[model samples]
Target: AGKKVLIVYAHQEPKSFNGSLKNVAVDELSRQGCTVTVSDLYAMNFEPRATDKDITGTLSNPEVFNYGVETHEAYKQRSLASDITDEQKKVREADLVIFQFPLYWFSVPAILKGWMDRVLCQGFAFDIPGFYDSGLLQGKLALLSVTTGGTAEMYTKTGVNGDSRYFLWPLQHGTLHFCGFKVLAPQISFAPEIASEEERKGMVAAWSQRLQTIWKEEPIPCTAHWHFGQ
Candidate 1:
């Protein structure tokens, strides 16, 4: 049981509910004999901007800068910034990648978004005719363990916020599945700030319990049809 896990953690406070879930993941995965690595974005002050500095080499078109084209070239030539390469290395080595973050405006925090923009470049995560099921990292698994500000009831299909799956589509299918990852169902811990202490503990406990048999879990069909039924 030599599985490797990478938890891309994005939270400003170490004592936040997001942090609790992240810590429990480390503990549970470690107990299962897995090597766990956490990319604490805020602690590291991770660069969230995609710019010319990321290339670390002569731009293919210095006169007209394009982030996508440049980074893709940089990735191929191994000229990407070390920070980006470091994260990519972790992703490459991991069997499962868990994104731990609180939902920010129905999406990932800016820093995590930056990670996706800079690290998962064209040549690294996917290529033309090599996305979705044919993605480069096809065999790897990914999961989103997200905390939210709203209650479960408010995220229903007809609720004020609409179904949570609507928000997840871009991250789970567009991003993770596009890169060839088999995405496990997300773990949504709703309104942890308003929950009773016992409820918070229960949420953490449930996550820990799930990790005990995470490897046995099957990935969801990362498709719009599955997210929104006909």
Candidate 2:
């Protein structure tokens, strides 16, 4: 009877910082009368490949293997695998979708990326003229809760990796925003692996505090200027 939330979690270890953040989210959101569902990709051993198995029986165009087009037709025809459809159902019913993962080479892990690639097919997430502001998923909300091995300073504009927002452009602006999710400012927990136990607890507490105030927060204006400021 409350808001439905789906957390797409990509972490191999349940005791890791990424796990800690995910657990905190579940705890806080559950306490606030939200129905929270988490897709633990590792535990589920979720298939990370986008292949012809995604479609049932035969492809729409057997001569060619255009994944996007085939999957689009499969989506409309209701022939995608049970796992893909299951995740899609969770996404459709969720009011808020959260992606929790540690930064892998400055982007989401291959599994999560694959999840996006396979799950967000043409008919479901977008179409020719139905992307970005006009996407089919306009009413949904999305947030990225990320863990980083690099320190915050290292990710700064003047630092080795450049501004943190720079790396976020692809996921936040390209994927989530392009799919029309009202994107919340990311929750970036930095250097959790090197932090003290107290620091770890603080991180969890801070996340909880944010969740307490999440409903009152506004989404970031996900635009070119917002990501790359002058």
Candidate 3:
């Protein structure tokens, strides 16, 4: 299904390099002739932190982990579980999803992760079973776009983190892929702070083109040994 795409971006300062990168990505995808939707988490004042109330519970059963609103007497029956009423539907509507953010602590920004926690609820992104069952989000496409202060070498097999590439394990193996969407490896921009103006411009231009192509490509393979491995 060659359809439109959705981008959920998380960064506080639009003027910041990360924000600029986000815009560059959006513009590039649009230029490539794909319908795009961008959710700027900071501009939207999105809540980044997770809470007991937002999630139901840990996956207990291996085959069929039940998850969702508890709907106790304090809370009556519910339909749209997340605060963002249309998030679930949006995921369903698009053929591709781009989770864009800066690499922080070797993972996505807190807000973007929070968006996943809230939007990718049980029965949606995956099964609650300890077995990592695929759920509502199965079969969709997902790509990760990240900004990093470190260079490609820094995040490598023998850079600083040992031989481990476990940065995106949860996203590639557990979340997006588990749901069944073809998960593409990340589209990353490295060392933006020190890059020269020419370098920055070239990097942005290069990323834009790459993303345009990535949006059309099927979810690519990422090794599991890599954590959060996008």
Candidate 4:
């Protein structure tokens, strides 16, 4: 059977250059014999704004608070009503999961964040005693793919982006890793605006080429528990 992969894509402008990159990733991932499931958050009208609905049942059913003390009811139910359910099933089934997006305010787009808020629920992602050690997902893989207008070097600790890995560590380790996924080193593509036609082509080629390569690569392990003195 083919490898199963899930690409949770978040881009509001499908015709924009970022969208082009996403398409490139799709083509590349598909070529790698992956049965890919895509979550086009924006195109699906995914709402990122957290609402009161997510926390309504919390007062009585503390299970609702399992998502987070900050979680609300509108957001929770909306998530169940949104693409999260499908994402939950896909994530459980996938051997690999990729989060593809453009960085917004040093983080993911609203909808993508929203998906994390809802899908990475209590019991499924985190535990009361052990943050990462008690996570539910294990033996799975989560990879991050992102594009930025800034130069790649800019994300370095000594550079402007304040450690690209730091930004991802929380997402990779705190979330996906905590949930027991073996988070692979992220794939970052930068300088999207200055790339010439050939450069753009290379993006697609490189992504596609790597799709096959990543299948054999070792996943980037999380240092989450080590930080907790466990």
Candidate 5:
């Protein structure tokens, strides 16, 4: 009942459908007595670039620049930028992390993508030998609550988009699962823009209801076979 939750919200407008989802999550989780923290990416003008600027102090190798290698080294030296560290603290304390956003180009927005890149660096989120099931963030849970422009039928196996799970593989397995967070089945509210007002309300209500019992849910089997099938 006292679990800590972090919602990385990445949408421009508060009145947007993604915003409603984020708000409902805060309301529902808080109502359940869970502490919730929200990272409003757009409002905060969150940096979406993985550059040398992320390192506060001097670079380990001043001549050349490699993002992954440099960030890994800076992370160990405790010289990462303050913003990155601040978000890392929230992730460290959170029992569950819910990503609330609209589907952007079959992935997260660039800003949220930058959050993952900068915050979940090597040694913090995972290491070479400590990835996958043994990642640093093991025991924590993560869920993606995404709203899509495409309809449900269009995301089926034979549909135009060729299964919604296809799009989820990278985020669910490659990113979240790689970091050792058990992945929950995504909440995909399809085509809210085209739906009627009642339909939109239903989608919001459904998300709220799910959060009431989120802790009781089991994570999906995040695997290539599960996403791709036989």
Candidate 6:
């Protein structure tokens, strides 16, 4: 069966290197008989805030405005906004979810963070007892395909920004792994803006080649030891 892939993209400039990587993923995945869907966050201008507006009908408890509790109940009752449900639906259908974005302040862009804050509700993505090794999204694979303005050397154990794995701990372990996703090793393309046209093309081409065999890969052990060392 063909795999369903949902790419959550967070760059506004369609001509940028982040956009190129996203396009190549879609092209290569589709050519390989995968159904690819892209959620272009900036283009969608998605609501980056979690508010009462997220709930269409009555709140579970009108007295308090707990975003998590309210939204969790709303999700169960099918009262969340159409937009949130639409994205969640895509996630539910996807065998793999890839986040494509330019690194923003060593973390995800605010818009992408917003997506996670809202769509990945406590009941949907995780519950108190159902997390980490027993997470709800156990069968789903999550990947971070990221681009950065800094060179690779700048992001190492002794470099200015520290190890690249340092920055990834939050996304890979705190979020994705906590949610029960099999976290794929990230694909980081550094300093594409400073590279020549050929270099940029080469990076994009390399990504396309990786996708041709991505399904054959295994998830990284998402743990503190993997990111930090003994």
lDDT per residue (tens digit) for residues 4-88 in model 5? 9999999999999999999999999998899999999999999989988999879988898888888899889999999999999
Comparison by lDDT, 2 against 4, better one: 2
Please give each candidate's TM-score: 0.99, 0.98, 0.79, 0.81, 0.98, 0.98
Worst 10-residue stretch by lDDT in candidate 2? Answer: 127-136
TM-score ranking, best first: 1, 5, 2, 6, 4, 3
lDDT of each: 0.95, 0.92, 0.67, 0.71, 0.94, 0.92
Model 3: per-residue Cα lDDT over 157-196, one tens digit each: 7678532246667766666766667777677778788799
Task: For candidate 6, list the clashing residue pairs, or say none.
Answer: 156-163
Better of 3 and 4 by lDDT: 4
Candidate 2 local Cα displacement, residue 85, angstroms: 0.4
lDDT for each residue of candidate 1 in 125-178, tens digit (9 for 90 to 100): 999979999998899999999999999999999999999999999999999999
After best superposition, candidate 1 residue 195: deviation in angstroms?
A: 0.5
lDDT of 4 at 123: 49
Clash list (residue pairs), candidate 1: none
Please name the candidate that would achieve the greatest lDDT relative to the true structure: 1
Q: Mind sharing the TM-score for model 1? A: 0.99
lDDT per residue for candidate 6 within 1-230, as digits (tens), equals: 37999999999999989999999999999899999999999989998899999999798889979988899888889999998999989999999999999999999999999998888887788998889988888899999999998999999888999999999998899999999999998999999989999999999999999899999999999989999996
Question: Model 4: per-residue lDDT, tens digit, 1-230?
Answer: 26788888998788866677667767777766668788898877875655445444334354444435444333335434435556678888888888888887777887899888777766445656445645667777888888777787887767977667767766877678778788787878777778887787787677767875877888765784432322
> In angstroms, how far off is 90's CA in candidate 3?
1.7
